[PDB]
Symmetry: D2
Subunit: 432 residues, 4 copies
């Protein structure tokens, strides 16, 4: 499974490669300490929430264990039609989903356009394009605290009013009879969308993981009653884990230029928005003076190109060296292309190992893994659109869980921020 | 200034008294360390606010340095009529204040009655009693964070909506044309009410202190621009200071039964809501078996009785031993009445010393005390309705500030939660 | 197993008893959090030692995981004669032990007398009393750090020289040809003495526990090679555990008068030197005014009397109320004697539960408990000389380890500070 | 005082220079926060020592405030001859000093050679070379804790015995009648040597500073009696200050490769053993691809070359570009030599500013600076053998102390580890 060298490599470049690979090496002895720290942090977060479920106090637990206020999960037997709003950065979409009683979802369109007074006409605009004249979901990936499932406040980016009723009154100002009923997170929607579209002869899903341009997790905590939680599903803020991470110096520099400094140190090692910069810096270090002038720019390499480099099988890597030219205007030789492959294979492997040791921790906090069986729905831009990264995540997950790997199933879910919010708004209302 | 014994005291009781007095003794060497810790904490809080002015992170600074979003202070030259709402616990009042251009306030009534749908009719009910048919202030002493001067959220006790517009729409639902325009704290209103009613030949006020059933402070920070503050007045959450306090064991037990545990340890040593319990516990310890059966109850002694015991000049203390009987159904002898006086004189003296060392710290953070002169407006139930406590606070304040005591003036302000909110709503609107 | 009341109890005293019993109640839900915190602390201590095995850094781990520098444990097959020195406080002993090859120890005398220049003549004085004219052990329970097995430094109480060679040169100054070869702790000697005198058909011993006027533990860590330890046996400083303890307010006051303040909070809840004060304070609180004048003294009740109260079976508790009079000069009635019994039964039960949850943690860090079997040697003044405390410790230990209680055996060892140091000095030398 | 550019610089290289200079910029607003943090840390260290003067607890204070056990300082009126031993790394010296009663020292030799059994013959070997046949000092720069002035223990590098008597018995084994009487630090010897050789018309010295291949400080604390100190001079472990430092990313990487990781972060920014690496890394970053192959080696540039670059006045910098070739085998052009000068001038200026703000803090803890006058003796390899670094340290020290700069005098002391230990051994013995 490891890259093999046949071309004669210089001594200096080989020494540099060997020195910079052992800075990204994750042995099966550190992964156990990682799993233990993760489980302990989960438990401490639960207790600290029970002590004061309103404010999040750092230095008590890195995970701000949020709670979706949902009542119960779906089973794949409902029916209707429901609409959902996604709102991230500059331009995002609107979803319409039809639900039959057989565990299947039908979706129509994801319209993008470049301000609460615009979205009501947007919903009427997509609705007239179906003209079958209720309740609408909402994702709203922004800094918000949700005391209840219907409302959530805004504390960052009228910038401070209720972001729920703000959207609600735009339907009243217009003709549209549709009300907001849920403000879900990106991962709980993933959990629900995976639970719906499973089937009937599959174990229940208990963990929803997002690995993409951001990393997060939600899971079903059976002891939710012993603490003060109202929903059966708990949203871990997984990206903020900082107990003991194997940080190389490149991770110490790339964090200083972050504009989010000293925050979210676990997300900056495994997420797809940061792997391109890691491999760029490592390549600059290993090709000291031979590096081009473009290899010193900031955003000169993103993870979509690492995906191209990893999934390469040509006799001569004419695709792996065509992605070099258009990014770094440089004609790579054989030793340099070998170095590039050996660096990407290390960075992505570390990401996959650390993201596989965070699923075993969740599956170990739930003490079901000993006897019963259950499933996990993994979604994201790193899991999809990458083949070398799936069979590696599931290889590490098959070694962390030594004798129990067969009890935990992986089911790739799709489109959490969409179908998820629609299914949540359908469940919270049809079963209201 | 110290109590003198002439009656022959038993040896055991004298030993116990001497042992329990030295547990409440504050020497002029510890007060300096206190002042230094306080000043350092103020500076650290300012910096930590500049780093992230949204969330309060404990273990960065005990003071959550809030900010009133006011523009500028009054001078005593405005005019009009304005109404204010107070809302604490079970039953609180409504205020109407007339303002002339000479630094004088005229107030009408403080009606009490035992639920946002009731207060609009309350305001119309007080208004019809003057029938001179704008803007209304609001104090709202509850857990709230205020991103702006007009709005504030509710996170504790619809329990979560906007507590500003909640009150505002009740005037629209009714006929009353009055809108909320400010949600002030108990101490910034004190500052403003003191600034208004000063005169013309007095130094400017810079600190507003509340010492009562609760302790708090607000002050004018001249470096407000260097950090991200929008108002010239900063609200210290002074009650939460916990750096290094001289805690006796009685303070360790009375905090365990608090229902606010491990929070606000500086407020539980100096505020008027906790001195009665302190003196009750100390009396139980010094009168071991001679204590009555009522001296073991919880709320059997409040600070209004300590005020009676302190301000006593009768030949035979027939008032200090009449407050004993009706509270602890017991006929005190001479040694016991001496012990009671010597215990109250120690508890209240420690409170006064620690509250005088917290004014010197604020007056030292403002570096004006070296050359110029300014004033401080002290308000509360301990300052008013107690004579032994004023000339003692100002005795300690005259020894902490060795050569500068003449630069700082004390001006007793009155009724902060009332006239304060009215004057703030008048200034924010007439000078809008 | 619980005390039963038949005599009619007053309402007030019954309310007070019920209120003060629930402050000492340990449910089987908190014991699990205790075990988890203990195991995590053990692991963190091991890692922190590997990072810097010289200085102990608090806030890294409460346990300063010391190391005995022993080579290997005995098996009960050696032979010879060896001498040991004990040195605690004012007056302590000297031991002579003969060792045959069958797992049996023969001891002679423990002489007490009320200064390194005296102990050599003491050893010659005990030796002449046997006149069979090598190597001598040493316990030396004082503040000392031991870089090697032969030497240890002194940092508290020439007060600072080498406390090993100090004793060694006194044998050279005299005629005695005996040299110090080991400075062991009170618990590793217990471990060795238990390992020797086991037999041949018993599982191996792995934990040595001391529960007396002080609490401590040592255990065999199989992963000693992965970290920088030279001995197979690790000395936990178990008394300093302070992660999350169920502290009543009486424990908050009794710690303030400690002269060892904010240090060793786990030892002050379970050790035999502190249970008498706990029960004295609780009795003062429950018998508010009926308490005598002697119940307010400090050392008016020690654990030897609680042992007498617990192990009482007379028809009328003429022994449990005879221990009252000579200690508190008071003729207890029936309700008061019931209260006293119900208070001692709670204090000692909490101690036994918390000391049984600290053995399960050690037995869980060693992952052998799943399949194999092993033993633990418990010694101390609370285990011996108390019958109600053994069958209660082993009742809680049979419920903490649900399905594995049969894998762990309890073997009461005796005289650790004696036979232990002798056997260690014999093993380190005969097998040198 | 700033470098001026006249040669036309490229746009890219100019942008890089301007971007990397503002990462080393120290404004007069941060220096005040630095001084405040330093003073607070000093006070906290003093208190924490008073609470437990035996063990050093980090997270209480970064400064382990050690204490020299000296009685009193010299005045320059003694007489005699005394010998001193220095012992650092591989090869170090022996000193002989003659002392007259006029404040003048006469020194003979510093012999170097490449093991306590060798130093006695070394002392006899230097003594026979003067053949004027008492007491000997000792510096011994190694990890050691000194409970008393005569003895000190060894805990790192027989490796653990008494390093005082170890040297003492070598004089008895030989003929030499010379005994060790003091084990001083590198900075207290500097203080004493400065105090001796002052004169008679100079203010008293109170601070001794070492700025070289290591940074440290000692000072006279007038409140030494209020705490448990026996000597009037306190040894700050100044290099370990880590409260809030302006760390660039280069300092984050150079610390990861330290072998002393997460320890002594203030020493790694200002000391002469680390400035060459800083400027090397910055030069690699600013000359991205134009850098040579030798500029990527580790020890390719030490501070002796930065001293050469700074003190350059030739028309064409034929010395500043001759130090480039022999170190980095590269013919620098004009833009590159300008960049090199502008980088060294920034690194050394930051070091000088931060080392000048640490003298103002010490001079501010002693409250004498307000009225009286005193002096400070600065020694080290950065102060001596560098002219641009003295008039810059004293320029920053003249701006930090706004109105008091004339009260504090700087007196360059010489050879602390030598004359210092001799003078200390002379004072401790002649005035014994």
């Amino acid at each position: 499974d490891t890259i093999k060298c046949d071309i004669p490599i210089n001594e200096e470049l080989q020494a540099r490669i060997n020195k910079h690979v052992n800075q990204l090496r994750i042995t099966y002895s550190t992964l156990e300490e990682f799993v233990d720290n993760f489980v302990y942090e989960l438990k401490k977060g639960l207790e600290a929430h029970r002590r004061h479920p309103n404010l999040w106090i750092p230095h008590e637990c890195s995970f701000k264990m949020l709670d979706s206020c949902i009542a119960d999960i779906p089973t794949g037997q409902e029916k209707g039609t429901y609409y959902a709003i996604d709102f991230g950065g500059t331009n995002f979409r609107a979803v319409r989903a039809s639900l039959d009683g057989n565990g299947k979802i039908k979706r129509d369109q994801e319209t993008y356009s470049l301000l609460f007074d615009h979205f009501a006409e947007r919903i009427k605009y997509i609705m007239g394009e179906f003209k079958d004249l209720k309740n609408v979901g909402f994702t709203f990936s922004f800094p918000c605290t949700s005391p209840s499932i219907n409302c959530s406040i805004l504390i960052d980016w009228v910038e401070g009013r209720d972001v729920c009723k703000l959207m609600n009154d735009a339907f009243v100002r217009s003709e549209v009879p549709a009300k907001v009923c849920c403000v879900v997170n990106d991962a709980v929607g993933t959990l629900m969308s995976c639970a719906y579209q499973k089937g009937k002869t599959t174990p229940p899903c208990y963990i929803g993981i997002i690995l993409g341009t951001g990393s997060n997790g939600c899971y079903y905590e059976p002891e939710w009653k012993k603490y003060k939680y109202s929903g059966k599903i708990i949203n871990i803020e997984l990206g903020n884990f900082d107990k003991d991470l194997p940080l190389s110096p490149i991770d110490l520099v790339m964090d200083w230029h972050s504009a989010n400094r000293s925050r979210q140190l676990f997300e900056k090692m495994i997420s797809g928005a940061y792997l391109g910069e890691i491999v760029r810096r490592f390549m600059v270090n290993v090709l000291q003076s031979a590096s081009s002038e473009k290899m010193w720019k900031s955003d000169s390499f993103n993870s979509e190109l690492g995906s191209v480099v990893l999934n390469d099988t040509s006799p001569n890597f004419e695709e792996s060296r065509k992605v070099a030219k258009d990014a770094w205007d440089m004609d790579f030789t054989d030793e340099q292309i070998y170095a590039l492959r050996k660096i990407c294979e290390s960075v992505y492997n570390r990401s996959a190992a650390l993201a596989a040791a965070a699923i075993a921790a969740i599956a170990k906090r739930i003490k079901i893994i000993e006897h019963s069986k259950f499933s996990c729905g993994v979604d994201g831009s790193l899991f999809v659109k990458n083949a070398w990264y799936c069979k590696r995540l599931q290889e590490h997950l098959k070694v962390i869980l030594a004798d129990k790997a067969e009890n935990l199933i992986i089911i790739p879910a799709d489109d959490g921020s969409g179908k998820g919010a629609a299914i949540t708004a359908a469940v919270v209302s049809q079963s209201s």
